């Protein structure tokens, strides 16, 4: 058993052709595209005229990066590594022209230039020749190219075939051919073909390249575990991929290509949590933002009304999405994500100002309003929300019930409010208590009238300011809390308790102070959701193993799969749907799905009849292969029914006898090793 990059058995690989169908109604195919290298490439070619001539490997296939070139031109094999400037359609140009004599190759159009050469080989043949015979593809060549830890390995095999299409069903191992110590980073590769000049091709004279009948197949290796069979001479005469079907896995586990009748545990299946769950206690009682926002009375800008918010949770998504506010400026903070954080001090300042003055309510703004009526700090993580109020703050005759402060000794500090009747006096022209020259009262009249323009209409502005303190925060927004999912395996995190299980409705009655739930083994059994108070149970995910019920490979290769201790609905979720397409999902689900007490049985047909137990499944259920033939699961019969004819005066005296010899085997000793 070897774990290495292999081509999975019964895979489905790409097919390429290079052929010009006779006549103008046919197809002119020159398949030679640049293909990814992946972690390994399997290359096969069925040919009779030897159109294939080599390969190209590299990352960009240009002078930018190093590349590897392999070509054979009917008497040599050349391997080179250079920063070749490959053509977009490289090939070898065969020519029927009699320049010297016979067919020859004369148009080497693979690469424009070779630079920064590292090494070159002139190794001996893959010959092959320049012959153009027809009929069936008489040779089959298989190659495996691998590039690992700075070494490039090439395996190859050559066999004669009598096929005309597809690949033979025979089995053959590809012996190593060459290994190269190259640190190149192969990622894309391309195929080289020997084209024929239509200008100088037998019968054809039109300008162009024509390709003879050629067919090659490309596959990609994957990391697989294979069970290879070495014969007396060391040749790999057979192999088994340990991923193809349950029978293959059973053979691989038993390390044998022949499996006897019985049930074998091959692997263990686990159901992973779907995506996630995270939960913390959502929120305390809502804060009274409506009072400030929908306040019956609003104070002047110089006397903005402040409401302190504490012992609650901020919530404004209902009004934010309404889009009913003319301004929702949140400076330096997301308009919604700010709520998800603890805030020790929260304030709501409401005032009525002119529409043009709303722009002055910004952190760090300076002016006759910001520096004298409402000053915001630079560290303003709050939001200033302004909306028109002409429908309430306007009437016939106008309103004259507002004041604003314009004169003061110094600019106001952030969240600084001061109301006084002291008369401001100029330094050079003091008044000493009177409103004289260069002396003005701090407050000035202010108001609105219906005739005012849009920019001059009243606007209600509410500022929700937040600041952090060392003291514990009361207005806090919860951390990432997702929605609850039930009856579905998932990885949950309840207030720091990380667990994986299935959340379901529970009838257990906790206590008001109880959150967790435990069993005799001190394992989390039930949990209470902190956001909303209800009790949910915790259950393991699936656990359980996988057993491959099968008769002997001799007789039939049909098998059945048993998944212990799981409902028959979770079988495809146990990391299934990723195995081999045509062999595993058939046993993953389908018809004849039976729910035994020992687990879920698939591939076996339940039968009313009861027979002698053939293969023990468990809980009185046994499986047999005999009935067209198919695996059947039944309740084993504990022998044939009988009822002795008993009466008070009847006896049975035997009239004949049989001398029966029976064999008993008893181990007497085990090998005495030291």
């Amino acid at each position, epitope marked *: 058993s070897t774990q290495d990059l292999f081509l999975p058995f019964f895979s489905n690989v790409t097919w390429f052709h290079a052929i010009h169908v006779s006549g103008t109604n046919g197809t002119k195919r020159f398949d030679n595209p640049v293909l990814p290298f992946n972690d390994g490439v399997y290359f096969a070619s069925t040919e009779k005229s030897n159109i294939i001539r080599g390969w190209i490997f590299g990352t960009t296939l240009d002078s930018k990066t190093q590349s590897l070139l392999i070509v054979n031109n009917a008497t040599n094999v050349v391997i080179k590594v250079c920063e070749f400037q490959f053509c977009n359609d490289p090939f070898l140009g065969v020519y029927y022209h009699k320049n010297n004599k016979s067919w020859m190759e004369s148009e080497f159009r693979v690469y424009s230039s070779a630079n920064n050469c590292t090494f070159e080989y002139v190794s001996q043949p893959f010959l092959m020749d320049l012959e153009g015979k027809q009929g069936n593809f008489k040779n089959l060549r298989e190659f495996v190219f691998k590039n690992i830890d700075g070494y490039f390995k090439i395996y190859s095999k050559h066999t004669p075939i009598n096929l005309v299409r597809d690949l033979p069903q025979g089995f053959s191992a590809l012996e190593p051919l060459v290994d190269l110590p190259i640190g190149i980073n192969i990622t894309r590769f391309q195929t080289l073909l020997a084209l024929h000049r239509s200008y100088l091709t037998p019968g054809d004279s039109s300008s162009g390249w024509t390709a003879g009948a050629a067919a090659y197949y490309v596959g990609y290796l994957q990391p697989r575990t294979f069970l290879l069979k070495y014969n007396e001479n060391g040749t790999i005469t057979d192999a088994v991929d340990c991923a193809l079907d349950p029978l293959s896995e059973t053979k691989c586990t038993l390390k044998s290509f022949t499996v006897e009748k019985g049930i074998y545990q091959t692997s263990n299946f686990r159901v992973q949590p779907t995506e996630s769950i995270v939960r913390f206690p959502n929120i305390t009682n809502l804060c009274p933002f409506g009072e400030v926002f929908n306040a019956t009375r609003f104070a002047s800008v110089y006397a903005w009304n402040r409401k302190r918010i504490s012992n609650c949770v901020a919530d404004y998504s209902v009004l934010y999405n309404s889009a009913s506010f003319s301004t929702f400026k949140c400076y330096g903070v*997301s308009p919604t994500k700010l709520n998800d954080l*603890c805030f020790t001090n929260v304030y709501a300042d409401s005032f009525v100002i002119r529409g043009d003055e709303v722009r002055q309510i910004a952190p760090g703004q300076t002016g006759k309003i910001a520096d004298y009526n409402y000053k*915001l*700090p*630079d*560290d303003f*993580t709050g939001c200033v929300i302004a909306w028109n109020s002409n429908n309430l703050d306007s009437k016939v005759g106008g309103n004259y019930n507002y004041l604003y402060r314009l004169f003061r000794k110094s600019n106001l500090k952030p969240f600084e409010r001061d109301i006084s009747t002291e008369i401001y006096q100029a330094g050079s022209t003091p008044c000493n208590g009177v409103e004289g020259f260069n002396c003005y009262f701090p407050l000035q009249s202010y108001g609105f009238q219906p005739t005012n323009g849009v920019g001059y209409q009243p606007y209600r502005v509410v500022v929700l300011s937040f600041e*952090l*303190l*060392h003291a514990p925060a009361t207005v806090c927004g919860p951390k990432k809390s997702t929605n609850l999912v039930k009856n579905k395996c998932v990885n949950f995190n309840f207030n720091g308790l990380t667990g994986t299980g299935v959340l379901t409705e529970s009838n257990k009655k906790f206590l008001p102070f109880q959150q967790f739930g435990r069993d005799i083994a001190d394992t989390t059994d039930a949990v209470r959701d902190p956001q909303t108070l209800e009790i949910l149970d915790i259950t393991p995910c699936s656990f359980g193993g996988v057993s491959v019920i099968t008769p002997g490979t001799n007789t039939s290769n049909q098998v059945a799969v048993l998944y212990q201790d799981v409902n028959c609905t979770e079988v495809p979720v146990a990391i299934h749907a990723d195995q081999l397409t045509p062999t595993w999902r058939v046993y993953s689900t389908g018809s004849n799905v039976f729910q035994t007490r020992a687990g879920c049985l698939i591939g076996a047909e339940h039968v009313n009849n009861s027979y002698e137990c053939d293969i023990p499944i468990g809980a009185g259920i046994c499986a047999s292969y005999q009935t067209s033939q198919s695996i059947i699961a039944y309740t084993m019969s504990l022998g044939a029914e009988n009822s002795v004819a008993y009466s008070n005066n009847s006896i049975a005296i035997p009239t004949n006898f049989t001398i029966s010899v029976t064999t008993e085997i008893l181990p007497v000793s085990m090998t005495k090793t030291s």
Partner: nanobody
Amino acid sequence: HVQLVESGGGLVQPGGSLRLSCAASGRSFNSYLMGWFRQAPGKEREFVAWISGSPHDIIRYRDSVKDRFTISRDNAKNTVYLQMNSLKPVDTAVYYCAVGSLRVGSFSPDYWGQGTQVTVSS
């Protein structure tokens, strides 16, 4: 007892760059603003920069240190990293790291360290 320890100081000629670091221990600093202050010999201490540990990083700098000094913090380690770029001789001073609260929207230091010398001269 909340304690602050500085590191990363030394001598750096003009045109160089440095990384000053301070580690804070004693309690969680999620609701704390972390910043740096410097005081040159013969001159009063001056505010350099401060940054908030909230999910939204609120960051500030003094007028002279705009676009040349950078401040960052890591809440997992309760550490603050300060980047000096395009240092001039005027930057020679003792630099301290401060843990403070956000009072009235102004960074108010609460805990101070010992400080490290950062000299700028050829």
